[PDB]
Amino acid sequence: INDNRYINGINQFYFSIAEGRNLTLGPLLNMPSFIPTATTPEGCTRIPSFSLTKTHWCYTHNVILNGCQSNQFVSMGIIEPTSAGFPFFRTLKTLYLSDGVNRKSCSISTVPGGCMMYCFVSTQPERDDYFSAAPPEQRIIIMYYNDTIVERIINPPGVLDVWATLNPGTGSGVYYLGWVLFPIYGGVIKGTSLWNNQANKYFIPQMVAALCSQNQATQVQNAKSSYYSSWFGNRMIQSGILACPLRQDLTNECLVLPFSNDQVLMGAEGRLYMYGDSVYYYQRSNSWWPMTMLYKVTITFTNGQPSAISAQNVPTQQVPRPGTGDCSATNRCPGFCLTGVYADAWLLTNPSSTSTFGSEATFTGSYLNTATQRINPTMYIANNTQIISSQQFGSSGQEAAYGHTTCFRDTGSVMVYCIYIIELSSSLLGQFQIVPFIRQVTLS
Amino acid sequence: INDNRYINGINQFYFSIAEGRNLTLGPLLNMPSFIPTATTPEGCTRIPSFSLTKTHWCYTHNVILNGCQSNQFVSMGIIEPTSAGFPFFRTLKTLYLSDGVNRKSCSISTVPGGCMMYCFVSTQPERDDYFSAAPPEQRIIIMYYNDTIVERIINPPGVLDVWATLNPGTGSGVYYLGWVLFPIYGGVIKGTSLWNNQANKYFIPQMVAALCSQNQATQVQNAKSSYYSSWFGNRMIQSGILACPLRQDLTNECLVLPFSNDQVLMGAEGRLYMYGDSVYYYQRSNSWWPMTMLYKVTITFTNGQPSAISAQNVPTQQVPRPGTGDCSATNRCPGFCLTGVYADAWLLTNPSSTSTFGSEATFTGSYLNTATQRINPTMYIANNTQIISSQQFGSSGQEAAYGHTTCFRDTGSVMVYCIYIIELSSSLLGQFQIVPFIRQVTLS
Amino acid sequence: INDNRYINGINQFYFSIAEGRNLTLGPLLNMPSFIPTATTPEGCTRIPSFSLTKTHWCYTHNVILNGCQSNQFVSMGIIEPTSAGFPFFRTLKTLYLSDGVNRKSCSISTVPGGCMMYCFVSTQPERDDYFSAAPPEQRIIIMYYNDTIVERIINPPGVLDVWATLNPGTGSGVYYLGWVLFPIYGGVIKGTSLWNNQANKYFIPQMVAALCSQNQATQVQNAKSSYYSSWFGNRMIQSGILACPLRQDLTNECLVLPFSNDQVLMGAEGRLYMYGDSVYYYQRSNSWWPMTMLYKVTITFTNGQPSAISAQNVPTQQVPRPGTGDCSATNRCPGFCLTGVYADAWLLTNPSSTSTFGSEATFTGSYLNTATQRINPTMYIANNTQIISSQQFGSSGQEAAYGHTTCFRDTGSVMVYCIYIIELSSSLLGQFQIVPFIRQVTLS
Amino acid sequence: INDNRYINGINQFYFSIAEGRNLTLGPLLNMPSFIPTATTPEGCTRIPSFSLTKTHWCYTHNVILNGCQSNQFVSMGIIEPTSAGFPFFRTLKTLYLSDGVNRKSCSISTVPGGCMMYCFVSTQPERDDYFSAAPPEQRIIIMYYNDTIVERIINPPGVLDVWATLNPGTGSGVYYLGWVLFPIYGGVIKGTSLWNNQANKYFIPQMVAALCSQNQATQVQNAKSSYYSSWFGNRMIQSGILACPLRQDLTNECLVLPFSNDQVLMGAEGRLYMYGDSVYYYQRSNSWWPMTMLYKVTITFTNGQPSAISAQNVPTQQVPRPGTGDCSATNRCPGFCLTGVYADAWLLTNPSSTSTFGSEATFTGSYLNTATQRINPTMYIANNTQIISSQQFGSSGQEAAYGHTTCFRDTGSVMVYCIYIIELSSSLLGQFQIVPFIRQVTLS
Ligand SMILES: *[C@@H]1O[C@H](CO)[C@@H](O[C@@H]2O[C@H](CO)[C@@H](O)[C@H](O)[C@H]2NC(C)=O)[C@H](O)[C@H]1NC(C)=O
Ligand SMILES: *[C@@H]1O[C@H](CO)[C@@H](O[C@@H]2O[C@H](CO)[C@@H](O)[C@H](O)[C@H]2NC(C)=O)[C@H](O)[C@H]1NC(C)=O
Ligand SMILES: *[C@@H]1O[C@H](CO)[C@@H](O[C@@H]2O[C@H](CO)[C@@H](O)[C@H](O)[C@H]2NC(C)=O)[C@H](O)[C@H]1NC(C)=O
Ligand SMILES: *[C@@H]1O[C@H](CO)[C@@H](O[C@@H]2O[C@H](CO)[C@@H](O)[C@H](O)[C@H]2NC(C)=O)[C@H](O)[C@H]1NC(C)=O
């Protein structure tokens, strides 16, 4: 179990609104990395997922032997203090799922006594998945600290003949009230109930108006069209949550809960968080709006089962991501787009602490500082409109990809540490080196 | 425990003399590295030690937060096959000794149910250790797989007032007949019994004559002087073995067994191996002879206690190491030298299988292919006089340091794999990145 | 162990009713304090707990680095005579629980061979604890004189879903018939069995009638309402006792025994005492009645387990405490109040020695002599209606807070000494300086 | 024993000459004080002595019940890290020597397994001691951690009829090569061998010339006269060292070793230190030169017994002390003086590391910043000519007295902490409150 110094400093808003204004990033600190490196120049390690809870943490990433176009590495352990005062992620178990099953886009989550991981089995190019009317096989693997492993092929209702494809968001899932929730996304088939119930719905971030040159009627029209991709088999690209009861005999008990397209952007990879008793969702900006999308999620239970989800966006115009064409970091107008990168963000302040939800919110993470290239990885702290602290890693031109950020407090020294897991392009070993950067978020 | 595919393919001579002639190195294979990386540009990870036995493996290295001038990372696990057929070193436990005790030059060894590690506590520059008449504190830490940890300060007899300094060789120790043996080295004080019993002794490798331009009388004179260093407090630089009975209450039961200077070169870092029931020793070439030094060690027991050791050198003139001044890779004449690098080698063939010990021996490892710089890491297979297979890693100029090689056979596919643990200079994260390269040693 | 001069003079009523009338306080005596001071102007040391038994004493207090809004200091030792004749509390062991766990409101008790301490883990403002339906984590730490330490998270039955919060009373617990008893208090949830069984119950001290201007029917109505706080999450503020069997593997064996609200006032901090074989309870006056509340407790065992407690109040109208608003030291009428200070009192005379329980009782302690401010610390001796001896410490305006009093007799010189542990506001080092004042209670 | 984080960071020069230039004092940190407070307004606690060694620390001070014109408190324990990273001096044993023997001016020293304390028995005003030809009784008490206590009255040779008085310097003694060394001082009788061998000797600090307005011949004449006090019975006020072999049956084995008056100023209180294998001495400036006096001491052994001592002064003109009349902090000219205060200093840099001994030395401690009053306690870091960092404690006018400073490094976090034990005048409890201030000495 995690050291006494951390058990009470996990999954919470660490600073008050007032303190958020005076936060700065400290130096990067050196700890033994718990994320394995490739041993060949061409080896590819990508798509990390990290979940940290009161008792322990779970980590996983995909490994491809030659180039990035597989096996899945899983790790679990605890956090303990070093003589220098900062954390050391102590690995207590390692697993390497290598058996011919092409598990991809995996999301992992901590569960009592272990880790639960959700993946889909890839057997063809992603685009092909959207055209085929049949969805890929879905699997959830439970790995207990006692070395028992139980993998199950799941068939949640409302998937067959509704979703042409379904993928985990790769971002971490969370254990909530006895259920394990994972972010999901995919393409929905035209004419289905889901498609019809979503017809004419769209979402436009609160701060777009002041930045978009188009008029309200034009924005609305374009936003509605941003949820359908002709390139991806003419499907409605949908975001949602997969709720699975913690059981070892899962078959069709997991539930697919899509977000209303009136509250969320075009479906994309994502991540789920827990701040106190509240669930939050991060949605990759793979559509027209290039800014960090975070939402407070309200989950409704009907007869002990998740029945519906509602999302409330934390309005911002900060931390853009690189994109292609008319959907770069400089875009501000609605339209159909299918480009971007995963770059989640951690809320250091409570958005509900303000009279108007998210009026003044502070968050931290990493982002690729450039308009269209996956370059210049930069760790930062920002509020709704400005970056109040940042530090680029490496020299300009340094290639990078996804970034997963997680923060926690050591209740002993009373300092907050954040880990920024970044896929870095390496010239020595492997295509990428996934690095768990760690530093302190200093108040002052 | 290690998978059934490896339990019977460890610590043995894998090929016959005839087969050794047709061995070649296969491609480097990509597996998730079990050696942790640094998370800052200046973080320094160095001095690895690796021990692999029938049941499991132990690994460790030193971590310094800023630059390479500390904490000690320890790891243990097993080996299991991947769907591609090659090994995956599965970590089952990690430890990070971080408590203010500056444990250095650590050597680790597998023991039933865990790992036993031997280190010395550094409190001043190495050179200062040789001048002070008092030796540094010596410690042996036993780490059981059940998480029990027992560290002891040891005071073996014949150390105080005999050795000005004593260090583990950093290379792996071995578990032999109930005792854990570690390679050691240091400086002996003038006028001591050890010094007197070693007076006038010297060793000249069998193949030096044909390569050295000096006459026999001159070589002998210079060789005798190569065991005394005026730079290192005027001490006799001695190599030896530390034998410790496997106990949890060690105090003064461990025994210091020095090698006779008539059979070994000037003391240096080293490593111990087990090939069947035979113990072998690798001695770093930190003196005048720049070639790989391997010896078969004969251990004598008197009353259940190791009482003396004898070494028989495997005569070679292959695989040189970079050195400074008149002691570079091109040197062949005896004289005092104190320069070199650690680069052990694994014997793929049995030296005793030939009528004349080591007349035709084959070994593999890595070496820095250059005369004086620690550059051009190159993995190879060689016999007594030639390199019969090799492959440089990276582009010329690539900096590197130590290299620890370990080979084992998968008795299922019947192929031999060797892991080359190499300290590589990295430009991205940390001063060095210790990489566990792995490939196959192919017969044909 | 305590010196022979004290082993037989602990936890007893030292004077007869007749002698109690002629008791006066002697000068304060100077002994080396056994309570550590802060080393910074802002350091905060508060909330002491002190337990003294036949063999030894246990002491503890909370330490907060900046201001009083943590770590827990623990100390244990014995009492021995000085050449001047008075006591010296000799510390034989010190401990500083500093590990990130925010242990608060701790109560300590002597146990054979050590100390047992009970705390709760605070993670949010106190008021928040009452609103959340989940109670804070509860912990009991046993610290043996042999340096073994065993901490356990306890989950006594009848706490979850009954008590929104639960805290130790901070006053000392006592070792009784193999069980360690601690005073407790907190908020009970509406609709629970406890709440229902307590419905319509109330307690009005025997001497209130003659001092209250309201009529009997009005007093009764207001008293009933004094047990419910809308400010503290609409909970019934309850007082009680936590009984824990002396074991090192405690989980759910400790028992929560609430006092009947027909015999005790609104729940508050408290302390348990032992006078001979009788258990006594002190209840902080945090409600409407501002006078010292002491009760003789009768404990019932069913099958070797504490099953119920009954309290009999020692009727007084002496020694008031400062309070806010209509609940100051001058208040005498029932109503809802949530203000006051901890100020226990030691009974120098046996309340049962009189035909009518407590008809003539004498006690000693400290109290803040003022109506609404925590000012003017004053040590005293008093009977049911008057203060018969007193001495203010410092000059008027001197700030102070809690006061823990403990008396014992030196059977050698035959004199009674009392220690008054008082939190004093200091201008030099720290926010408060907890001082163990000591003097004699003279007969004459 | 001390935590692993400190065992290797004690009694050493922590910084290089270059680093000494960039040292600053950090904030004062709050830890539970290990020095007991008085419990009455008039209680007097004074004259602390503190010794810290690899394994543990020893502490002691004098306690007088009424005013400062007795009993002796002794404490011993270890150092361990807190969750905030800084030290906590954990007391493991306390003792209170209270038995009618007036032990004064005690100096304490750590010894293997305990503490050895040296005191003299006062029976009359100090001045009377100098006039009486008979010296006061001398005692050394050994207190082992196992609670065994052995006190002995000692009669070292060369004391009777030579020294009219003899006192420990109150500063800590040190354990050196099997002997416990304590600083001493007193008055020598006219006509004795010591007096004759010291006749015409004098010492003038290297930096006095440039600051003194008198000529060389006048300075020399006045300096010679500064070693004789007509006020103190016309004795030669001498400084020295008392060497005692670590034995439990001491009688006349301890040796009185006086310093040559050609290398040291008029006798005064003092302290002994150990930096590596070197012994250093601090001499209170109770004579004409008001600046910090530190000397490297060379001890000569003849037949296993200390036979002579030699002192080499570290030349400075920094950190003056308050004095009376023509001997205030502003004085610079030789002459007879008998005024000053104890204020030792710790060397953060090695004086021998410079080509010219002490040419650039850095030290830290506390000093009363004023010309003639014991006021304005101020902690500082200084070099030979300037104070490069300082912070006054309290508001101007704050009375204080002695200051004992001790520094050590936590080899885990790699930071240096210094404890400044200062006698502070308090208005609340006791005449003085001896406070163990602690902070970090930051490099940068
Ligand atoms: C490892 O821990 C898991 C989690 O408890 C154990 O799982 C139990 O498995 C049995 C069937 O094999 C179920 O009936 C239980 O309900 C499971 N426990 C629950 C509720 O999670 C697993 O058995 C453990 N490994 C072993 C066999 O030691
Ligand atoms: C985000 O942070 C920025 C920078 O701190 C805030 O901008 C400052 O706003 C204050 C007004 O309260 C001005 O006094 C400063 O001059 C602004 N800084 C500058 C120069 O840009 C910004 O208001 C924050 N956004 C919010 C309100 O969340
Ligand atoms: C080491 O390997 C080399 C290369 O295989 C051996 O050299 C060969 O020796 C044979 C004689 O048996 C010749 O026919 C080849 O022409 C040699 N190779 C060349 C061209 O260098 C060498 O003999 C081996 N060393 C030993 C005997 O251990
Ligand atoms: C310190 O004293 C305690 C109190 O006796 C010892 O506790 C015992 O612990 C063992 C398990 O470790 C139990 O089985 C015993 O019942 C305990 N004794 C009882 C009844 O209190 C503790 O072991 C002592 N410390 C040591 C190990 O020397």
Ligand SMILES: *[C@@H]1O[C@H](CO)[C@@H](O[C@@H]2O[C@H](CO)[C@@H](O)[C@H](O)[C@H]2NC(C)=O)[C@H](O)[C@H]1NC(C)=O
């Ligand atoms: C508490 O103590 C007071 C003071 O000693 C008692 O009051 C005295 O009562 C006696 C009657 O027995 C009178 O003779 C005195 O004049 C009273 N003292 C004064 C002047 O106040 C009081 O009775 C005691 N309370 C009890 C009975 O416990």
Ligand SMILES: *[C@@H]1O[C@H](CO)[C@@H](O[C@@H]2O[C@H](CO)[C@@H](O)[C@H](O)[C@H]2NC(C)=O)[C@H](O)[C@H]1NC(C)=O
């Ligand atoms: C506490 O420790 C001291 C230190 O070892 C013990 O002292 C020994 O006392 C005996 C006589 O009583 C001597 O003969 C030994 O030489 C002493 N030891 C030495 C060399 O220091 C002391 O006895 C211990 N306390 C006990 C009795 O347990």
Ligand SMILES: *[C@@H]1O[C@H](CO)[C@@H](O[C@@H]2O[C@H](CO)[C@@H](O)[C@H](O)[C@H]2NC(C)=O)[C@H](O)[C@H]1NC(C)=O
């Ligand atoms: C003690 O410290 C002072 C302050 O750092 C030193 O004075 C400085 O000396 C340098 C020359 O190397 C000048 O450049 C600075 O201007 C001086 N500081 C000032 C303005 O006073 C002083 O030299 C040090 N004393 C020594 C040499 O030990």
Ligand SMILES: *[C@H]1O[C@H](CO)[C@@H](O)[C@H](O)[C@H]1NC(C)=O
């Ligand atoms: C943060 O720093 C600013 C600038 O000094 C200060 O005014 C503010 O009070 C700080 N915020 C808080 C309340 O911690």
Ligand SMILES: *[C@H]1O[C@H](CO)[C@@H](O)[C@H](O)[C@H]1NC(C)=O
């Ligand atoms: C190795 O290869 C050579 C060349 O083909 C062959 O002649 C030889 O028999 C082989 N060695 C053995 C016996 O495996």
Ligand SMILES: *[C@H]1O[C@H](CO)[C@@H](O)[C@H](O)[C@H]1NC(C)=O
């Ligand atoms: C206490 O003092 C009173 C007044 O002198 C005296 O009458 C009484 O007897 C004393 N009490 C006892 C019995 O000790």
Ligand SMILES: *[C@H]1O[C@H](CO)[C@@H](O)[C@H](O)[C@H]1NC(C)=O
């Ligand atoms: C100390 O700080 C000064 C000023 O920045 C810098 O020049 C110097 O190198 C530092 N000293 C060292 C070597 O640590």
Ligand SMILES: [Ca+2]
């Ligand atoms: Ca499909």
Ligand SMILES: [Ca+2]
């Ligand atoms: Ca040495």
Ligand SMILES: [Ca+2]
């Ligand atoms: Ca609650």
Ligand SMILES: [Ca+2]
């Ligand atoms: Ca005298």
